[PDB]
Design a protein around this nucleic acid. Structure first.
Ligand SMILES: Nc1ncnc2c1ncn2[C@@H]1O[C@H](COP(=O)(O)OP(=O)(O)O)[C@@H](O)[C@H]1O
Ligand code: BEF
Ligand SMILES: [Mg+2]
Ligand SMILES: [Zn+2]
Ligand SMILES: [Zn+2]
Lengths: 645, 645
RNA sequence: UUUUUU
C-alpha cells in the first residue's frame, strides 16, 4: 500500500494567496500504483494531493523534502519513477514524515518574517485565514465543522508572503466544531533533518551521576530483562523490573537463579515471593497495586516492554516516570525491541509463506492444509474467543490434538510437550512463554475507539481492524526462536505502530478508580509524565477531558464495582457506575447483555427509560437524558478536543 | 466499472445450516477486473461475495439467476469470462437485479415448506435465526446493531431444509438496533422472471377506455414535452402538462405557437397567461398552489420530467396520482428520458469529449480551453451557485459573454439569441431548451441526506457527491436538442438513477405545512399514492415517521415562517420552527449562520443555550435537550425505521 | 449549500 500523488494544489506566486486543484489520477493509476509503487507521472508544484487505497490527504515540499503526517502516511513508501521511494525522515513524536522531493518538485521557503496572520490551504484549494496563537496552534476566524478540514492533514500554513510556517495535523474542536488548528512548525522539520540518521542505544546505559530517563532498543532475547539487570545488580545496584505479563515475571526467578545465580523478588497478584535480593520482578499491575514507588528502594527501574499500548503498562510507566526521581532512583530505563514507527523486516530463522485457498481448513477467507499442522507444535492466532473455540473444535473433530487459549482460561490447557495446535487470541502473550514450530496468523486485531458522538456524550466501540507492526512482529515472533520456524499469513498488509486511541486513556482512568484507589487527578499526573516523554507511543492529549469525566462519577455502589471487577470485563468502573445510576433511579440498564449482569437480581424491580451516561455497547431500552450525571458528562463534552484530520 | 466476484460463502450440504467464506480476489484483482469487466476465475457456489469500487455485498443464485439488490449493484454489468455481463433483470421497484448465472455457479432451491423458522446468511458467514412475520419481513431473535448487517445485502434467507426464501435488502431499526429484516421474497424473483426482458414505452400511450397510469420513455430532445401534448390535443383531448422547471414552462409558451400552432395556457407564480387553449402547461408548484386536480378539467395529465426528485415534483406527482381518476382524467402519463434503472447511453446528436488537465480555465480538477466556448452558445454546469458566480466572473474577465443562472435570478438574464456562455446550477438541468452548442459538466452535485443521529434526534446534511445517471443524461441532454452538440465532462462514471433520500420526504411535509396548507396527514395520502406507483423513483418508506414529527410542530410563529418562505432556502418550516422555539425561550439559534437570519435583529436579547430540536447545520452554541418539543421528537425516533444496510 | 410554490 504505497502513497501516491494523485493531484496538486496550485498556489499563487504573487499578491493575495489563491489556490486551485488539478487532479492527475482518477483511481486509475491510483489504487494500481498504490501497489506497483511506480509513478510515471511527473511531479510539479509544491503542494501534493496524495492518497492511499483508503485515505487521501496532503503533503508539502520544504527544503527539497516532501513532508506529511505520520498518522496519515505511516512508514509507507512514496510512489515515483524508480518504483517505490523509501521515507528519509520518520518522526512519530512530532507526527511528521518526509520523502526526498521527486523530479520537478519545487519547495516553499521557511517563513522568516515572523508573521501572526497565517493561511491554511485545504485539499479543496480553500485558503483559510488562521490567527497564530502558539508555536503549533492557530485560531480559526470562521469556525468550521471538523468534516470540512478532513483530508487536509499535511497541508501548509503559509504566511502573507507565502512562506511555509508549518503543516496542518489536527483540529481543536468544540462539540465537533473546529475552532483552532494544531500544526507542525517548519522548525520541527529543520530539527528533523539535523538529527543523527542513526541513534544507537543497543547498550545498557551507564548509571548517570544524576537521575536520568534512558532508552534501550535491542532485539528480543538479548538479556534486556535478564542479563542487563544481572550486570547492574552485579555492580551492587538495586533493580526493580516491570513487565506486562505475569507469566513472564514469574518465569524470571527460576531463570535468574539459573544462568545468573540470584534469587530475585517476584511480585504478582497471584504470587508474591520476598527473598530479600537486590533485583525484583513485578508486573505493571502488581507495581500499581503496591502504590508505585517507595523510599529509595531502587536506583534502577527498567520498564520492560515499554512499547505495549495496554492501559495497564501505560499507566505503570507513567507512575514510574513521575515518581522514580523522588523515590531516590538514579536511572529509569525504557526497554523495548520495537519502538514506535518500527517496521516489519525479514527474520533469518523464519520462512514466511502466504496462505492460499487450497487447504482442508477454512481460515479467514483462505485455508490451512492439514499436513501443515498435523504433527508438530503450532500456534494459530484468531481475533476472537469464539473463533478460537470454533477452530479448536473443528481441529479436534479431525483427530488433531488442539486446544483454545484466551483470557479466562488457565495456561494448564496448553501442553508444554508433545504435538498440539494452540488456537489463541493475543492473550497468549501475557500468560504463556513457549514457542512453536510454526505460527498461522489471521492478521486482524480487535480494538476499541472512542467516538465523541454527542448522543448524549461519547461511545466506546469495538471493531476488528488489520494488525499493526507490533502485532505482526510479536505474533510471528512466537516461532523461529533458537531454531527454524514458519510463519503463514492471510494478508501481507501491515499498519503503522507507535500510536494508541483516546479510549485507552479512558481505560487508564477507569483502572485508577477501580483497582488502585487513584484519583483521576493522580492518574493525570502519571499519564502527563508518560505523554511528556519522547520515544514512547503517542496518543492525542485528552487528559483534561477524561479527568473531568471520571471526577464527577461520585459515590459508586461498591457491590456493583466488586461484581464488574471480578467478572473481569473492560471498563468495570464505567459499567459499575452506569449500573449504580440505574439502580438508584429504579431504572433498567441499557440492555440485558452480559455486560450488565450485575443488575440481574433487580431485573423485576427496574422499569422505564435508562438514564444513559454514555454508550459502551448496544442500547436496546428507551433512554432519558434528564439525570444530572448525564448533564454533567454533557458539560464535559464542551472542552477543547484535539482530533486528527 | 463492473461488479466483481471477489469471494463466496459456502453452505453446509447436510445437517444444521453452517457457512464459511472463501476469498478469491484481493483489491488489485478487484479493480483491474472491474474495468476490463473480464473475470476468468471459476465461479462456484450459490452465494457470491461481490464488490464495486466503493461497497461490498452479496449475491445469491436462484433458478439459474445470480441476484442482488439494486441499491448495491445499480444497473452495473458483472465481470465475466468473455467480458462484462449485462443485467438480465433490473426491477428497481423490488430493489432486485439479476444476471444470468455464470457457468459453474449453482442455484438454491426455493422454499416450499412455508416454514417460518428462517436463517439469514451474512457476509461474514454468520447464520442468524429469523422468525418469518410477513411475506417479506422477519424478526431477529437477537437484535443487533445495524452496522453488523452492513454489507450483507443480497444474502439469502433460508428455511431449515436449506431452501431459499428470499434475499436480504434492509434492516428495520429502533434507535439504531435492528430488530427485524426486510427481504425480497423468492416469489418476486419468479414474478420478475415471468415478465419480459425487453420493454418499450417509447410511443405515446393510447388513451384507454377506463382510467390508466402509463409511462413514456424517450431520449432527450425527442418531443415528449411538445409534440406529444400537441398530438393528443390535435385529437380532441384536453391536456395538462406538469413540469418541474419554470424556465421550461415559460419556454413552451412562445415555442408552441410557431412550432405546433398551439398557444397554450400557462401557469406559474410569475405568469398565469390564460388562452383557453386545450393544452395547459404548469409547474408542479403552481399546480399544488391551485390545490391540485379540479373536477372534469382534463382528459390527460402529463407528469413531465417524472425522473425529477425534488420535493415539489414528488408531492405534485403524488397529488395527480391520488386525485386524477376522481377528477375525470382518462390517462396519467409519467414521462421522462431517464426512468429509474436507466443508464447513460450514447445520444445520436451528441459527441462526448473528456476535459483534460490542459486549458486556460481550471474546472473541477481539470481544465477548460477558452477556444471551446469562445464562439457559439454554451452551457456550463457548476455544483454551487457560488461556483457559478466565480466562474462566470472569471469568464467575463476573459472577453467572454457569460451569465450565471440559478433560482432567485429571473429567467430573463439568459440571452435567447447569439453567442453566450451560461453558467448554471441544476435550475437548468431538466426540461429546458436554450439552443446550446455544447454542455460542459462538473459531474458533481449537491444533495441532502438524513442521518438518524439521536444527538438528539436527526441530522440533515448537505454534501456534494458524484452525479447520478439521470443527472449526466439530463445535463448532457441540454445540448444536441434538434441538432449536433458537444458534451464535455470531468469524470466518466455515474451513480445509479431512480433512488432518493428520506430527507426528501421530510421536505415534502415541510412544503406541505409551509406552502400548500396541507396537514401532515393529507401530505401522507399524496406521498402514499406516489410510493404505491410502479416505475417511479424509490425511497425508503418513512411516511409514518415523518408525519409523526410534523404533527407535533404546532403554533409556529407565522412571522418567522413568512420570512423563511420568502428567503427561499431549504426547510423553511423546520427552520422557522426552531426559530420559534428559540424566540419563545429567549435563546439564540444553533448558530449565527445565514440560515438563522430571521433571528438576527433579536440577537441582543437572546442568551443561554439553544433548545435544539434537530440538526440542520453546524451547531456552534451550547444546547439544552429539555424542551418539550425535543422530547416529542426523541419519542418519534423510537418508531420502526427501515434502513438499507 | 441544487430545484419551487411568493
Ligand atoms: N424553446 C425552444 N426553442 C427552440 N427549440 C425548441 C424549444 N423547445 C423545443 N425545441 C425543439 O423541439 C424539440 C423537442 O423538444 P422537447 O419536447 O423539449 O423534447 P423532450 O421533451 O423529449 O426532451 C427539441 O429537439 C428542440 O429542438
Ligand atoms: F427529455 Be427532454 F430533455 F425533456
Ligand atoms: Mg421534456
Ligand atoms: Zn513569512
Ligand atoms: Zn422450506
Amino acid at each position: 500500500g504505497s502513497v501516491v500523488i494523485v493531484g496538486r494544489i496550485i498556489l499563487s506566486g504573487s499578491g493575495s494567496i489563491t489556490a486551485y486543484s488539478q487532479q492527475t489520477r482518477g483511481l486509475l493509476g491510483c489504487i494500481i500504483t498504490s501497489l506497483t509503487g511506480r509513478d510515471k507521472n511527473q511531479v510539479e508544484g509544491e503542494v501534493q494531493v496524495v492518497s492511499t487505497a483508503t485515505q487521501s490527504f496532503l503533503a508539502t515540499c520544504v527544503n527539497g523534502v516532501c513532508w506529511t503526517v505520520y498518522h496519515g502516511a505511516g512508514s509507507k513508501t512514496l510512489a515515483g519513477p524508480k518504483g517505490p521511494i523509501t521515507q528519509m525522515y520518520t518522526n512519530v513524536d512530532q507526527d511528521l514524515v518526509g520523502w526526498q522531493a521527486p523530479p520537478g518538485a519545487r519547495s516553499l521557503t521557511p517563513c522568516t518574517c515572523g508573521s501572526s496572520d497565517l493561511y491554511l490551504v485545504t485539499r479543496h484549494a480553500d485558503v483559510i485565514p488562521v490567527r497564530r496563537r502558539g508555536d503549533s496552534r492557530g485560531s480559526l476566524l470562521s469556525p468550521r465543522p471538523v468534516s470540512y478540514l478532513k483530508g487536509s492533514s499535511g497541508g501548509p500554513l503559509l504566511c502573507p508572503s507565502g512562506h511555509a510556517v508549518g503543516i496542518f495535523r489536527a483540529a481543536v474542536c468544540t462539540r465537533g466544531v473546529a475552532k483552532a488548528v494544531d500544526f507542525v512548525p517548519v522548525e520541527s522539520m529543520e530539527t528533523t533533518m539535523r538529527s543523527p540518521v542513526f541513534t544507537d542505544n543497543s547498550s545498557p546505559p551507564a548509571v548517570p551521576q544524576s537521575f536520568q530517563v534512558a532508552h534501550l532498543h535491542a532485539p528480543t532475547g538479548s538479556g534486556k530483562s535478564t542479563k542487563v539487570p544481572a550486570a547492574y545488580a552485579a555492580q551492587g545496584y538495586k533493580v526493580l523490573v516491570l513487565n506486562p505479563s505475569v507469566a513472564a515475571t514469574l518465569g524470571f526467578g527460576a531463570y535468574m537463579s539459573k544462568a545468573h545465580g540470584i534469587d530475585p523478588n517476584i511480585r504478582t497478584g497471584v504470587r508474591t515471593i520476598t527473598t530479600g535480593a537486590p533485583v525484583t520482578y513485578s508486573t505493571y499491575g502488581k507495581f500499581l497495586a503496591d502504590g508505585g514507588c517507595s523510599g529509595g528502594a531502587y536506583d534502577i527501574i527498567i520498564c520492560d516492554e515499554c512499547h505495549s499500548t495496554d492501559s495497564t503498562t501505560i499507566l505503570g510507566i507513567g507512575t514510574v516516570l513521575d515518581q522514580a526521581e523522588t523515590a531516590g532512583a538514579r536511572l529509569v530505563v525504557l526497554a523495548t525491541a520495537t519502538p514506535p514507527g518500527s517496521v516489519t523486516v525479514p527474520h533469518p530463522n523464519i520462512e514466511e509463506v502466504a496462505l492460499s485457498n487450497t487447504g482442508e481448513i477454512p481460515f479467514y477467507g483462505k485455508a490451512i492444509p492439514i499436513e501443515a499442522i498435523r504433527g508438530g507444535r503450532h500456534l494459530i492466532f484468531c481475533h476472537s474467543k469464539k473463533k478460537c473455540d470454533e477452530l479448536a473444535a473443528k481441529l479436534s473433530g479431525l483427530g488433531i490434538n488442539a486446544v483454545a487459549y484466551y483470557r479466562g482460561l488457565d495456561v494448564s490447557v496448553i501442553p508444554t510437550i508433545g504435538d498440539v495446535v494452540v488456537v489463541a487470541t493475543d492473550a497468549l502473550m501475557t500468560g504463556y512463554t513457549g514457542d512453536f514450530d510454526s505460527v498461522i496468523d489471521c492478521n486482524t486485531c480487535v480494538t476499541q475507539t472512542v467516538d465523541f458522538s454527542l448522543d448524549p456524550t461519547f461511545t466506546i466501540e469495538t471493531t476488528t481492524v488489520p494488525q499493526d507492526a507490533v502485532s505482526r512482529s510479536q505474533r510471528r515472533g512466537r516461532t523461529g526462536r533458537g531454531r527454524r520456524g514458519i510463519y503463514r499469513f492471510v494478508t501481507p498488509g501491515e499498519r503503522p505502530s507507535g500510536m494508541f486511541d483516546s479510549s485507552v486513556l479512558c481505560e487508564c482512568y477507569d483502572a485508577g478508580c477501580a483497582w488502585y484507589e487513584l484519583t483521576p487527578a493522580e492518574t493525570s499526573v502519571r499519564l502527563r509524565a508518560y505523554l511528556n516523554t519522547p520515544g514512547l507511543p503517542v496518543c492525542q492529549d485528552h487528559l483534561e477531558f477524561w479527568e473531568s469525566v471520571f471526577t464527577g462519577l461520585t459515590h459508586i455502589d461498591a457491590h456493583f464495582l466488586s461484581q464488574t471487577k471480578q467478572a473481569g470485563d473492560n471498563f468495570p468502573y464505567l459499567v459499575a457506575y452506569q449500573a449504580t445510576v440505574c439502580a438508584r433511579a429504579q431504572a433498567p440498564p441499557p440492555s440485558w447483555d452480559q455486560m450488565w449482569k450485575c443488575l440481574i437480581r433487580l431485573k423485576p424491580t427496574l422499569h422505564g427509560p435508562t438514564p444513559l451516561l454514555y454508550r459502551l455497547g448496544a442500547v436496546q431500552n428507551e433512554v432519558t437524558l434528564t439525570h444530572p450525571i448525564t448533564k454533567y458528562i454533557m458539560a464535559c463534552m464542551s472542552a477543547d478536543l484535539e482530533v486528527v484530520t
